[PDB]
Amino acid sequence: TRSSRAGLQFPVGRVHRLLRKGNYSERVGAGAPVYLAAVLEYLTAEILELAGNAARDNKKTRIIPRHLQLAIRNDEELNKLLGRVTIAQGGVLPNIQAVLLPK
Amino acid sequence: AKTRSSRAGLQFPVGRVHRLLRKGNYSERVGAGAPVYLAAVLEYLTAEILELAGNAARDNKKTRIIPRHLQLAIRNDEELNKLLGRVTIAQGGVLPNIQAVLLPK
Amino acid sequence: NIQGITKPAIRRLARRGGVKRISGLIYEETRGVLKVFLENVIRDAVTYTEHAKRKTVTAMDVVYALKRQGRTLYGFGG
Amino acid sequence: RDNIQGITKPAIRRLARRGGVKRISGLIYEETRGVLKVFLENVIRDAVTYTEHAKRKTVTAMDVVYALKRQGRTLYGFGG
Amino acid sequence: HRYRPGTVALREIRRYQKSTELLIRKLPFQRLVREIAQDFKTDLRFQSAAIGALQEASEAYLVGLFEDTNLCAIHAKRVTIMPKDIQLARRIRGERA
Amino acid sequence: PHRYRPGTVALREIRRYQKSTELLIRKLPFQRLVREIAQDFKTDLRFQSAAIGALQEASEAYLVGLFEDTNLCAIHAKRVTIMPKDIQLARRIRGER
Amino acid sequence: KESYSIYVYKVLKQVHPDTGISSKAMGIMNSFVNDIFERIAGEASRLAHYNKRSTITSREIQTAVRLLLPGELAKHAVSEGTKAVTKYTSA
Amino acid sequence: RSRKESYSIYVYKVLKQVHPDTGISSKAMGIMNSFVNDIFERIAGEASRLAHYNKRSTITSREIQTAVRLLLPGELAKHAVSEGTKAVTKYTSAK
DNA sequence: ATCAGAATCCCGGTGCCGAGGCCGCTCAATTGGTCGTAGACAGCTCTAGCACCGCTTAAACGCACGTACGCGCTGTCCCCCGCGTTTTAACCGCCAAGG
DNA sequence: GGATTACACCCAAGACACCAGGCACGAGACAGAAAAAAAC
DNA sequence: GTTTTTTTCTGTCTCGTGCCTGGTGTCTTGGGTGTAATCC
């Protein structure tokens, strides 16, 4: 497999197939799916790395989606990316306007 | 009628649109009725909005449509305004929004 | 009908929103805006299922209609 | 340099009046400058990136059109 | 005895920022969705997962719109919501003309 | 003389600028600011004028919309004087952080 | 590199036949037409890939016009499109 | 029985790489599959616009790079470009 | 401050259930081989982007000065919080039913 | 009633052959912005 | 201040042509649905 021959983890040829059946162009180059797969790979690495830290916070072993939404809403660039994104079982920031806290 | 435009009795070139679909990477194949159908929709949209353009330009005794006319005619419509909500026209401006708290009473 | 929305439901909506103090006409106004929201959503959802030539709206079509309103939601296979 | 301070208070006034704003506070102008600046930052970054792949050292109107369509602040008028 | 107001609400805000479970329970929400769905073509069947999707999207939608409305009222030198606040927030987002 | 305790000046110029068509920010300083921002990511870039005019158009439209929602925030604030946190609330609701 | 100018002239003479136009008005109009065409076409391509149909007929275009434009415009557009389908199909 | 798709095993392995002592729920795995779907779709749409604003129909990796740094915000994007470029070198340096 | 006491947190506990391992398939990735033109590239040409300046003038800046909305305060009055009391959809269940 | 499949049928893809329109450029005219009285 | 009502000088636009390029007529063939039967 080209992924192993690229030393990576995402299947190249599946992506090469999906680029064909997406009407994405007329012809498809050689290593463009490798580059795209690596992009996906680093993206999910960063996301789930912060998710792993989120599980480290709550001392949970299995990832709940609340961890995912929290780790999205903490980091800046990721939250600006997924601004129009919501997730089922998401929730929001535990956030209190202290002007509404009593005195 | 040799031309399909005369065979449709319309004003747009259909084979233009079919080549646009072909040189679009849109589908792999394109049937015969879809380009005619879409071109007819386009022609209706043109005539419909140009109606409001004609009345809005006639509001100011001017034979020529200006962009301000077009923005006025859009914002005075309801369906077209919710159509063009993320949309901005060059040389547009906005409506007269004088709040009632502002006039000298 | 629309009155199946209870007062403590919209109160819980304020609570997860984090809102403290509540007025009166809020309730009926809330039901109205929720109604128009669901109106547009389920209208184009049934439009999708109309093209599907099938008698059950798919969850897929719901997801794609949310994409069509720019309201992309993950989670349920989209 | 300092063309951020080339923004004039009477221009902000004129924009408020076509914007319909009556009364103008004094703590507004540099905040306005900062928001305008960040706006144009993201805009011209994306337009120049479109021109980076264009392999032409000059940015066109079409480029800026396509880039602002990418932001969804999409503007007609000049074709694109 | 009697507690002093405002407290229990914020305490349950701290409670309700925790579980992401669905607030509106199922059957009445389902009836409302079915009743609005009645008037487009007659008696369409439904996937229950799609119903959960509608429920999720609706609740998150309304929660976020509440957040903006609440911040509007906090700006408005007040604490309590008003319907005009919802009108202001919607007028900023652009649902209604 | 005819000093005029205020009211007709501002609203009259609003009437003039809404009778108006064209721009308000004049050309050269805006262009130089554009080139200063442009001199930051790739050096030495050339431009056609229509791009700059589109930039000026969309810039003034963006700020006009900011001013409109800011104006409605002020009207809800029972004031006519604007404030900066009005603009901050408006951009908070617009999701453009 | 063709614009749609005389098409606009003929629509205009079919509606308000004593009406001029500026250049940039035509430019904004063609901007508009291209935007609408692109939005519908891409939505139809979404119909294909969401429905695994290897081509597109007019029925897809009808449901896409439903998906974009709201009610009154949508119904009148469906009417005009089917009437054009009818008259082109008859001859 | 029609064969359906998932990306679960791949990102599952990646998760096992970056955190060996970590479990996950199934729904979240579906969420990540949808995540990959969404990011891929936005990229591909920018690729098609890259094509039509370049009047070309070949896709190389350069277009993918300029697409990613069009979509994603800067610092994250440059790190991802670095990862992809080093992977391009390691693959195409060999067969 | 300060105590009593609600409210919540947090620690074993067990249970149960789905995440994850696991295992035997088969179909798309692969491997290899064969045309082909799209594009990487060389190079031609004329436009337009740039820089500069002189002249014109309208547009900005500073200040003089009143002044009037913004605001802090006040009193007040009222109407949501909340806790209590009954409410009604709603759960599974079942014994008369007849029949 | 939707998913799968299979037999039908049937006209698009192309590939070539025939073609009047489509647009670039000009011209002269023709709707039109303003100059400036000039009322309310 | 608003706005109206005269010339004027005036910028664009519509008429006017020639060049051309995409648009059109039609067979083969094939796959792409059309539809129906059959699971589920």
Curated annotation (Swiss-Prot), chain B:
Any GO BP annotation: heterochromatin formation
N6-(beta-hydroxybutyryl)lysine: modified positions: 23, 82, 105
Post-translational modification N6-crotonyllysine, affected residues: 23, 105
Chain positions found as N6-glutaryllysine: 82, 105
Main location: nucleus
Residue positions, PTM N6-succinyllysine: 82
Modified residue annotations for N6-(2-hydroxyisobutyryl)lysine: 23, 61-62, 82, 105
Gene Ontology cellular-component terms listed: CENP-A containing nucleosome; extracellular exosome; nucleosome; nucleus
Any one Gene Ontology molecular-function term assigned to this protein's record: protein heterodimerization activity
Cysteine pairs bridged by disulfides in the record: none
PTM (free text): It is involved in the initiation of both imprinted and random X inactivation. Ubiquitinated H2A is enriched in inactive X chromosome chromatin. Ubiquitination of H2A functions downstream of methylation of 'Lys-27' of histone H3 (H3K27me). H2AK119Ub by RNF2/RING2 can also be induced by ultraviolet and may be involved in DNA repair. Glutamine methylation at Gln-91 (H2AQ104me) by FBL is specifically dedicated to polymerase I. It is present at 35S ribosomal DNA locus and impairs binding of the FACT complex.
Keywords from the UniProt entry: Acetylation, Chromosome, Citrullination, DNA-binding, Hydroxylation, Isopeptide bond, Methylation, Nucleosome core, Nucleus, Phosphoprotein, Ubl conjugation
Localization: Nucleus; Chromosome
Assembly, per entry: The nucleosome is a histone octamer containing two molecules each of H2A, H2B, H3 and H4 assembled in one H3-H4 heterotetramer and two H2A-H2B heterodimers. The octamer wraps approximately 147 bp of DNA.
Membership in a protein family: Belongs to the histone H2A family.
Record protein name field: Histone H2A type 1-B/E
Species: Homo sapiens (Human)
Entire protein: shown range: 15 to 119 of 130
Curated annotation (Swiss-Prot), chain D:
Glycyl lysine isopeptide (Lys-Gly) (interchain with G-Cter in ubiquitin) crosslink location in chain: 69
UniProt-annotated location(s): Nucleus; Chromosome
Modified residue annotations for N6-(2-hydroxyisobutyryl)lysine: 9, 22, 37, 55, 57, 69
First-listed, main subcellular location of the protein, grouped into a coarse class: nucleus
Modified residues (N6-lactoyllysine): 9, 55, 69
Chain positions found as N6-acetyllysine: 9, 69
Family stated for the protein in its record: Belongs to the histone H4 family.
Function: Core component of nucleosome. Nucleosomes wrap and compact DNA into chromatin, limiting DNA accessibility to the cellular machineries which require DNA as a template. Histones thereby play a central role in transcription regulation, DNA repair, DNA replication and chromosomal stability. DNA accessibility is regulated via a complex set of post-translational modifications of histones, also called histone code, and nucleosome remodeling.
Subunit structure: The nucleosome is a histone octamer containing two molecules each of H2A, H2B, H3 and H4 assembled in one H3-H4 heterotetramer and two H2A-H2B heterodimers. The octamer wraps approximately 147 bp of DNA. Found in a co-chaperone complex with DNJC9, MCM2 and histone H3.3-H4 dimers. Within the complex, interacts with DNJC9 (via C-terminus); the interaction is direct. Interacts with NASP; NASP is a histone chaperone that stabilizes and maintains a soluble pool of Histone H3-H4 dimers.
Protein name: Histone H4
Full-sequence range covered: 24 to 103 of 103
Curated annotation (Swiss-Prot), chain F:
Gene Ontology MF terms: nucleosomal DNA binding; protein heterodimerization activity; RNA polymerase II cis-regulatory region sequence-specific DNA binding; RNA polymerase II core promoter sequence-specific DNA binding; structural constituent of chromatin
PTM annotation (N6-methyllysine): residues: 19, 27, 42, 85
Residues bearing the modification N6-crotonyllysine: 19
Modification type N6-(beta-hydroxybutyryl)lysine: residues: 19, 42, 85
Location of N6,N6,N6-trimethyllysine modifications: 19, 42
Effect annotated for changing residue 5 to K: Reduced binding of histone H1 to histone H3.3-containing nucleosomes
Effect of residue 88 to R: In BRYLIB1 and BRYLIB2
Keyword Lipid biosynthesis: no
N6-lactoyllysine PTM sites in chain numbering: 19, 42
Result for mutant: residue 44 to H: In BRYLIB1; uncertain significance
Biological process according to GO: cell population proliferation; embryo implantation; male gonad development; multicellular organism growth; muscle cell differentiation; negative regulation of chromosome condensation; nucleosome assembly; nucleus organization
Keywords: Acetylation, ADP-ribosylation, Chromosome, Citrullination, Disease variant, DNA-binding, Hydroxylation, Intellectual disability, Lipoprotein, Methylation, Nucleosome core, Nucleus, Phosphoprotein, Ubl conjugation
Effect of residue 24 to R: In BRYLIB1; uncertain significance
N6,N6-dimethyllysine modified-residue sites: 42
Protein name: Histone H3.3
Range within the parent protein: 39 to 135 of 136
UniProtKB/Swiss-Prot annotation, chain G:
PTM annotation: Monoubiquitination at Lys-1 (H2BK34Ub) by the MSL1/MSL2 dimer is required for histone H3 'Lys-4' (H3K4me) and 'Lys-79' (H3K79me) methylation and transcription activation at specific gene loci, such as HOXA9 and MEIS1 loci. Similarly, monoubiquitination at Lys-87 (H2BK120Ub) by the RNF20/40 complex gives a specific tag for epigenetic transcriptional activation and is also prerequisite for histone H3 'Lys-4' and 'Lys-79' methylation. It also functions cooperatively with the FACT dimer to stimulate elongation by RNA polymerase II.
Any single Gene Ontology cellular-component annotation: extracellular space
GO biological process: antibacterial humoral response; antimicrobial humoral immune response mediated by antimicrobial peptide; chromatin organization; defense response to Gram-negative bacterium; defense response to Gram-positive bacterium; innate immune response in mucosa; killing of cells of another organism; negative regulation of tumor necrosis factor-mediated signaling pathway
Modification N6-lactoyllysine, positions: 10, 52, 75, 83, 87
N6,N6,N6-trimethyllysine modifications at: 52
Modified residues (N6-(2-hydroxyisobutyryl)lysine): 1, 10, 13, 24, 52, 75, 83, 87
Residue numbers of PolyADP-ribosyl glutamic acid PTMs: 2
Glycosylation sites: 79
Modification type Dimethylated arginine: residues: 46
Modification N6-(beta-hydroxybutyryl)lysine occurs at: 1, 52, 83, 87
Recorded GO MF terms: DNA binding; lipopolysaccharide binding; protein heterodimerization activity; structural constituent of chromatin
Record PTM N6-malonyllysine, positions in chain: 83
Annotated positions of the N6-glutaryllysine modification: 1, 10, 13, 75, 83, 87
Primary localization: nucleus
Phosphothreonine found at: 82
Omega-N-methylarginine sites (modified residues): 53, 59
Modified residues (Phosphoserine): 3
Transmembrane segments: none
N6,N6-dimethyllysine found at: 24
Similarity remark: Belongs to the histone H2B family.
Identification of the protein by name: Histone H2B type 1-J
Lineage of the organism: Eukaryota, Metazoa, Chordata, Craniata, Vertebrata
